[PDB]
Write an enzyme that holds these catalytic residues in place. Structure first.
Site, PDB file in Angstrom:
ATOM      1  N   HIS A  41      50.069  39.828 -20.144  1.00 30.02           N
ATOM      2  CA  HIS A  41      49.084  40.674 -19.417  1.00 30.02           C
ATOM      3  C   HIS A  41      49.699  41.441 -18.235  1.00 30.02           C
ATOM      4  O   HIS A  41      49.008  42.321 -17.698  1.00 30.02           O
ATOM      5  CB  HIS A  41      47.884  39.848 -18.998  1.00 30.02           C
ATOM      6  CG  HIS A  41      48.108  38.880 -17.886  1.00 30.02           C
ATOM      7  ND1 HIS A  41      48.185  37.517 -18.115  1.00 30.02           N
ATOM      8  CD2 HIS A  41      48.125  39.054 -16.539  1.00 30.02           C
ATOM      9  CE1 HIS A  41      48.302  36.893 -16.949  1.00 30.02           C
ATOM     10  NE2 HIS A  41      48.287  37.820 -15.973  1.00 30.02           N
ATOM     11  N   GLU A  72      51.054  34.707 -25.076  1.00 28.76           N
ATOM     12  CA  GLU A  72      50.935  35.177 -23.665  1.00 28.76           C
ATOM     13  C   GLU A  72      52.285  35.172 -22.961  1.00 28.76           C
ATOM     14  O   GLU A  72      52.299  35.374 -21.731  1.00 28.76           O
ATOM     15  CB  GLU A  72      49.879  34.362 -22.913  1.00 28.76           C
ATOM     16  CG  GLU A  72      49.380  35.051 -21.638  1.00 28.76           C
ATOM     17  CD  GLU A  72      48.851  36.477 -21.770  1.00 28.76           C
ATOM     18  OE1 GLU A  72      48.446  36.890 -22.906  1.00 28.76           O
ATOM     19  OE2 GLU A  72      48.909  37.215 -20.747  1.00 28.76           O
ATOM     20  N   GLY A 146      47.255  35.636  -8.026  1.00 24.97           N
ATOM     21  CA  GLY A 146      48.570  35.672  -7.356  1.00 24.97           C
ATOM     22  C   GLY A 146      49.497  34.563  -7.833  1.00 24.97           C
ATOM     23  O   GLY A 146      50.636  34.501  -7.340  1.00 24.97           O
ATOM     24  N   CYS A 148      50.137  34.044 -11.248  1.00 28.91           N
ATOM     25  CA  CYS A 148      50.555  34.375 -12.638  1.00 28.91           C
ATOM     26  C   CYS A 148      52.072  34.541 -12.693  1.00 28.91           C
ATOM     27  O   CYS A 148      52.641  35.247 -11.819  1.00 28.91           O
ATOM     28  CB  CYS A 148      49.841  35.605 -13.180  1.00 28.91           C
ATOM     29  SG  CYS A 148      48.080  35.278 -13.454  1.00 28.91           S
TER      30      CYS A 148
END
Length: 182
Positions: A41, A72, A146, A148
Site C-alpha cells: 500500500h 502485502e 505511522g 507501517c
C-alpha cells in the site's frame, strides 16, 4: 532494556532506511545487497526517496501467494551506491507463532521507537482495508498510523513488517527466507 530490544536495535541501526512515496513515510527494511521490503500500500513507483535522497527503483514486485492472494509485501531493488548487511539468515523458513516480539519504527514522526507487543499469532487470512490478505501475523497492541513498515523481531529472528491495525490489534505480513533466494 533486555535481549529482545538488543536484537531489534541491531536490526534498526544497520538494516533500515526511511522510504517516502506519494502515499507517505515508511520504515523500510533492507534485507541484502540493494534489496528492501515495504508494505504494498506504499504504491512504490519508478522513483522513491530514501533518507530524503531521490533514488531510482530498479525493480519492484508486489508479492502474492500461489492462490493469487495479496501478501502485502513489495520487494524493491534500489539504485543505491551501498549494500545492506545481509540478514537473510535471520528470516524464518516456515509460517509460525512467536513469543515476546518487538515492533520497531524509525520515521521523522516516530524516531527510535520500540514497542514490546508480546505474543504473535499466525492469524492467516485478513480482510486488510477491503483486500483479502494471507500470511498475517497478529499482536495485541493499539498500533496507530505511522507504524507501517515497522519491523517485527524476536531474539534471533526478523519475522514480519507491520501493515495495519484495527485500534486494538496490529497486523504484520510474514517475511519468509524463500522470498529472497537469488
Amino acid at each position: 532494556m533486555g535481549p529482545g530490544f538488543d536484537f531489534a536495535q541491531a536490526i534498526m541501526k544497520k538494516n533500515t532506511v526511511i522510504a517516502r512515496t506519494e502515499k507517505g513515510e515508511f520504515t523500510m527494511l533492507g534485507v541484502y545487497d540493494r534489496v528492501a521490503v515495504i508494505p504494498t500500500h506504499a504504491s512504490v513507483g519508478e522513483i522513491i526517496y530514501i533518507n530524503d535522497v531521490e533514488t531510482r527503483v530498479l525493480d519492484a514486485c508486489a508479492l502474492r501467494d500461489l492462490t493469487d492472494t495479496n501478501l502485502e509485501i513489495t520487494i524493491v531493488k534500489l539504485d543505491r551506491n551501498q549494500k545492506f548487511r545481509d540478514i537473510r539468515h535471520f528470516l524464518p523458513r516456515c509460517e509460525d507463532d512467536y513469543n515476546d516480539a518487538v515492533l520497531s519504527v524509525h520515521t521523522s514522526k516516530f524516531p527510535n521507537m520500540y514497542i514490546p507487543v508480546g505474543q504473535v499469532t499466525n492469524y492467516g487470512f485478513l480482510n486488510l482495508g477491503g483486500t483479502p490478505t494471507h500470511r498475517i501475523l497478529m499482536y495485541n497492541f493499539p498500533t496507530r498510523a505511522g507504524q507501517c513498515g515497522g519491523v517485527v523481531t524476536t531474539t534471533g529472528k526478523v519475522i514480519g513488517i507491520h501493515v495495519g491495525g484495527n485500534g486494538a490489534q496490529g497486523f504484520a505480513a510474514m517475511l519468509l527466507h524463500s522470498y529472497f533466494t537469488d
